Write an enzyme that holds these catalytic residues in place. Structure first.
Site, PDB file in Angstrom:
ATOM      1  N   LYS A 109      11.393  -4.253   3.838  1.00 37.79           N
ATOM      2  CA  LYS A 109      10.509  -3.132   3.491  1.00 37.79           C
ATOM      3  C   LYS A 109      11.100  -1.801   3.955  1.00 37.79           C
ATOM      4  CE  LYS A 109       5.833  -1.259   3.881  1.00 37.79           C
ATOM      5  NZ  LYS A 109       4.406  -1.514   4.224  1.00 37.79           N
ATOM      6  N   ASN A 113       0.824  -1.222   0.000  1.00 41.63           N
ATOM      7  CA  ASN A 113       0.000   0.000   0.000  1.00 41.63           C
ATOM      8  C   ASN A 113       0.853   1.264   0.000  1.00 41.63           C
ATOM      9  OD1 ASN A 113      -2.831  -0.979   0.130  1.00 41.63           O
ATOM     10  ND2 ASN A 113      -2.130  -1.918   2.056  1.00 41.63           N
ATOM     11  N   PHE A 114       1.902   1.252   0.819  1.00 41.30           N
ATOM     12  CA  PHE A 114       2.957   2.270   0.791  1.00 41.30           C
ATOM     13  C   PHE A 114       4.332   1.607   0.895  1.00 41.30           C
ATOM     14  CE2 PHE A 114       1.273   1.948   5.126  1.00 41.30           C
ATOM     15  CZ  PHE A 114       2.414   1.643   5.859  1.00 41.30           C
ATOM     16  N   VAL A 117       9.391  -3.167  -1.152  1.00 42.47           N
ATOM     17  CA  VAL A 117      10.042  -4.353  -0.574  1.00 42.47           C
ATOM     18  C   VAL A 117      11.163  -4.854  -1.491  1.00 42.47           C
ATOM     19  CG1 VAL A 117       9.718  -6.710   0.274  1.00 42.47           C
ATOM     20  CG2 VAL A 117       7.908  -5.027   0.575  1.00 42.47           C
ATOM     21  N   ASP A 129      -7.230  -4.260   4.333  1.00 45.47           N
ATOM     22  CA  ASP A 129      -6.888  -4.424   2.911  1.00 45.47           C
ATOM     23  C   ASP A 129      -6.677  -5.902   2.550  1.00 45.47           C
ATOM     24  OD1 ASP A 129      -6.383  -3.498   0.251  1.00 45.47           O
ATOM     25  OD2 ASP A 129      -4.237  -3.359   0.640  1.00 45.47           O
TER      26      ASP A 129
END
Ligand code: 1NX
Length: 276
Positions: free
Chosen positions: A42, A19-20, A23, A131
């Site tokens: 990440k 989502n933000f 990785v 999500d």
């Protein structure tokens, strides 16, 4: 173990973006002879204050979760970076599309069971994912999947069993429940709504032409958020996927019940999946 030194994290390649943030596949190798372990790292490169706060929250949530069907937290590196376990077969969306001819209904049912157990556990920790979708589900092997991307994940308040988010839409609308669309209300019941769409994704093999976005967009016709809300309140849903078992399609419809309390819990969904 939990403190990963930055100089030992040897970069290999890119994996993808949640989502933000982004990785990367790295080899953590303190001995310096690439005999170390492959890991998923990440980080946030191009991100505002809001995404930085969410990232601090993701680290603490994932650190505390312990399940076979939730991606394992390994540690942190400080330029703050989150170190997670690396699952080499990637995400389920691409896996179902690639291996559509080999994967029968019983296997799709196994992934549904494993995701449900993961979400049941996530409910016991009083954590909402926010999500839940095939793109955020990772693949360990042909017989094992894990839930991933806890960036938008929230813990329920100590006095309530729902979370009102002030921000509007940090993910695609086609997995959101009506009360999330209209009032930004998120709960374990809104996660169950999203599980119904995941069940739809599995049994379409994440085929792009009959995706949630593709199907709903045709119904919406010539504001996109407000139109989706109208359709759902009027009783419109995603159709039964081609060759889908009838019992599985009825569970989807129960997950898409208008009222949150009329949706089944993950504890009640589990046995119903496993007995087919
Ligand atoms: C080079 C390539 O084929 N990339 C594809 C593109 C899509 C994807 C996803 C995962 C993925 O593999 C892995 C493997 N292990 C992982 N551990 C944590 C992961 C993760 O957070 N992935 C997000 C991007 C993701 C959960 C939201 C994570 N992702 C690989 C790919």
């Amino acid at each position: 173990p939990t403190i990963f030194e930055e100089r030992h994290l040897k970069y290999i390649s890119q994996l993808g973006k949640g989502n933000f943030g982004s990785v990367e596949l790295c080899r953590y190798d303190p001995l310096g002879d690439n005999t170390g372990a492959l890991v998923a790292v990440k980080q946030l490169q191009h991100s505002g204050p809001d995404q930085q706060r969410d990232f601090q929250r993701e680290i603490q949530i994932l650190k505390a979760l312990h399940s076979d069907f939730i991606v394992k937290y390994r540690g942190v590196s400080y330029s703050l970076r989150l170190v997670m376990e690396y699952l080499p077969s990637g995400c389920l969306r691409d896996f179902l599309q690639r291996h559509r001819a080999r994967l029968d209904a019983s296997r799709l049912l196994l992934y549904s069971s494993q995701i449900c157990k993961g979400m049941e556990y996530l409910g016991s920790r009083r954590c909402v994912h926010r999500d839940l979708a095939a793109r955020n589900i990772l693949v360990e092997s042909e017989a094992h999947v894990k839930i991933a991307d806890f960036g938008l994940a929230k813990l329920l308040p100590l006095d309530k069993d729902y979370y009102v988010v002030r921000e509007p839409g940090q993910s695609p609308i086609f997995w959101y429940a009506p009360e999330s669309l209209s009032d930004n209300i998120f709960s374990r019941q809104s996660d169950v709504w999203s599980f119904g769409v995941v069940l739809y994704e599995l049994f379409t093999y994440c085929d792009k032409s009959c995706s949630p976005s593709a199907e709903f967009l045709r119904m919406m016709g010539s504001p996109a958020l407000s139109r989706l809300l109208e359709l759902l309140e009027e009783g419109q849903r995603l159709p039964a996927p081609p060759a889908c078992p009838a019992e599985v399609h009825e569970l989807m419809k129960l997950c898409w019940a208008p009222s949150p309390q009329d949706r089944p819990s993950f504890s009640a969904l589990g046995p119903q999946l496993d007995m087919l």
